[PDB]
Design a protein around this ligand. Structure first.
Ligand SMILES: NC(=O)c1ccc[n+]([C@@H]2O[C@H](COP(=O)([O-])OP(=O)(O)OC[C@H]3O[C@@H](n4cnc5c(N)ncnc54)[C@H](O)[C@@H]3O)[C@@H](O)[C@H]2O)c1
Ligand SMILES: NC(=O)c1ccc[n+]([C@@H]2O[C@H](COP(=O)([O-])OP(=O)(O)OC[C@H]3O[C@@H](n4cnc5c(N)ncnc54)[C@H](O)[C@@H]3O)[C@@H](O)[C@H]2O)c1
Ligand SMILES: O=C(NC[C@]1(O)CC[C@H](COc2ccccc2F)CC1)c1ccc(O)c(F)c1
Lengths: 285, 294
């Protein structure tokens, strides 16, 4: 396993260098998001909090949602320090009725959301037979079902004006799988599927102004899960993931992997049947 | 589009011939399923009904589940004609409490299930803004959440005996997407994710005796979806899909696409230059009755 470990380091180094080379040779155009009404769910901590900071620097109008009232007020105070106008609401993003009532409030107090970042997430790591049925339902209610209710509530206005951006925060767990996270991986696959089907349906209907982005990071140091011993993937910092997300949104990138070189592990999976799967699985344990 | 059509036709003719060549050069071993207790969900019609017929010919003991008592008893009558012992139960496979109570009944009247075929599914074709929230919940309750409850109830015995086979009936919609089927595609991606994560967790735990299979067919002529039309994929017959499934199960195949050459369309998607996606989308011309605006 020494040879495959060093080979993958070089493949990672080659991809990371060639990406930065293409980023200078063929730069992608960056749109403006100043004055857009951006709703961010799960904005009281982690990826959502630092994504709100990126949108505050971008001069957007923010609408922050979370069940953690103290947390979302801490994010809002920093966004205001950054010069942004912020509105916070305590919303359970896995409760359909709470979402619809809160959208009525956002329309009355702020206006029509133009960028939706479905970031709120939940996880209860455990093997399948050690999970609680309530936790499995909670995982689907927040990680995918809530994406349907928020998107359904906010899409009508975006379609009317032919202008919007729906961002789905999924995970590399929506493309690949990790043991002890069966319900979580299943809901993250569901999140990727929703992003892909929504993207295709907007093209089929002739709706050219509504963009879609899907954020798929590896483990991020937010406290979301206990720290692992992952030698191949990096233990990302929150600010780095929020920077990758804002860059992807401004550039209309449909699938944003963090780190971007994760796409090689995905390409290797579709061309690997099947004894070489376990060899790379033990290089990260 | 004449040039790209012949390029796709050649890649389908070559795959179908090379598969039959590998099927003779490196044949896969077919296990026996005689005497296994096989639970088939949604067995009152379509894929589930004809899969039950394949397992009846294989000499397994069948446990058929469905909300339609009339249909599941009609499938059981034919399985009995085929020489099989069959037990039917009226179970809502999207209801957690109904599932657990029914598993207690299956243990008392039949025994411990060894092969679970999570086949029951639903779909409500419509664009996202024309869907009903009840339909979105129903889609997830049956197409994925029910897979969790049934698997959780039946896995303990399989782990105790180091012997089982969990079959998840997903769709090509769990790998790719079709417009007017956003909630359905999302639920089918979740079914594929569950199959893949369950497969990996069994390996990680050292459980070697529990096999997993995932059935991913294109449109099948079962009435599930109305007037399906595909210019590049065929409109499959039910018996063909049930034959592909039984062959995959007996051979411990993890991902069963019907037709098997669909894997080329999936490989082409991961090496897609954006402008070539729309060219094959218009040549495919996927049609089916759905609620688009009205
Ligand atoms: N942290 C990682 O390692 C990681 C890996 C990839 C993807 N993700 C995904 O990124 C997203 C954010 O994760 P994070 O690491 O920033 O987590 P975090 O714990 O730092 O913050 C998540 C936030 O979501 C909020 N939230 C939870 N349930 C909610 C609900 N019902 N309604 C509203 N808000 C709710 C929490 O209160 C919290 O403020 C999630 O979707 C997660 O699955 C995380
Ligand atoms: N038909 C296709 O074109 C097609 C394409 C690929 C995948 N699939 C999948 O194959 C599976 C079977 O579909 P089909 O075409 O055989 O459908 P079908 O309509 O022929 O039969 C489905 C059966 O499931 C039963 N069922 C529905 N809801 C149930 C519930 N709550 N509890 C128990 N039983 C329930 C129905 O009563 C019916 O007997 C589904 O998971 C479907 O998504 C179908
Ligand atoms: O890395 C993420 N979590 C890490 C854990 O907190 C700790 C490790 C276990 C997996 O354990 C093993 C795997 C293989 C062999 C033996 C193990 F013990 C999963 C939970 C994580 C969490 C969310 C994500 O979205 C994501 F991409 C990654």
């Amino acid at each position: 396993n020494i040879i495959l470990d060093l080979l993958l380091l070089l493949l990672t180094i080659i991809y990371s260098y060639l990406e930065a080379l293409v980023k200078v040779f063929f730069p992608r155009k960056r749109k403006s998001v100043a004055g857009e009404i951006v709703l961010i769910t799960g904005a009281g901590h982690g990826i959502g909090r630092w994504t709100a900071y990126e949108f505050a620097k971008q001069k957007s109008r923010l609408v922050l949602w979370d069940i953690n009232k103290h947390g979302v007020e801490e994010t809002a105070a920093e966004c205001r320090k950054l010069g942004a106008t912020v509105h916070t609401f305590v919303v359970d993003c896995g409760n359909r009725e709470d979402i619809y009532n809160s959208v009525k409030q956002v329309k009355k107090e702020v206006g029509d959301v133009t960028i939706l970042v479905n970031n709120a997430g939940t996880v209860y790591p455990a093997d399948l037979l050690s999970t609680k049925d309530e936790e499995i339902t909670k995982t689907f209610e927040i990680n995918i079902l809530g994406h349907f209710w928020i998107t359904k509530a906010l899409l009508p206005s975006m379609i009317k004006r032919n202008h919007g951006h729906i961002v789905t925060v999924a995970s590399v767990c929506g493309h690949g799988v990790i043991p002890y996270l069966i319900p979580y991986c299943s809901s993250k696959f569901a999140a990727v599927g929703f992003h892909r089907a929504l993207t295709l349906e907007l093209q089929t209907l002739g709706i050219t102004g509504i963009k879609t982005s899907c954020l798929c990071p590896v483990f991020v140091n937010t406290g979301f899960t206990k720290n692992p011993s992952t030698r191949l993937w990096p233990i990302l910092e929150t600010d780095t993931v929020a920077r990758s997300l804002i860059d992807g949104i401004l550039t209309n990138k449909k699938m944003i992997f963090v780190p971007s070189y994760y796409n090689i592990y995905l390409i290797l999976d579709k061309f690997l049947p099947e004894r070489a799967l376990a060899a790379i699985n033990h290089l990260q344990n």
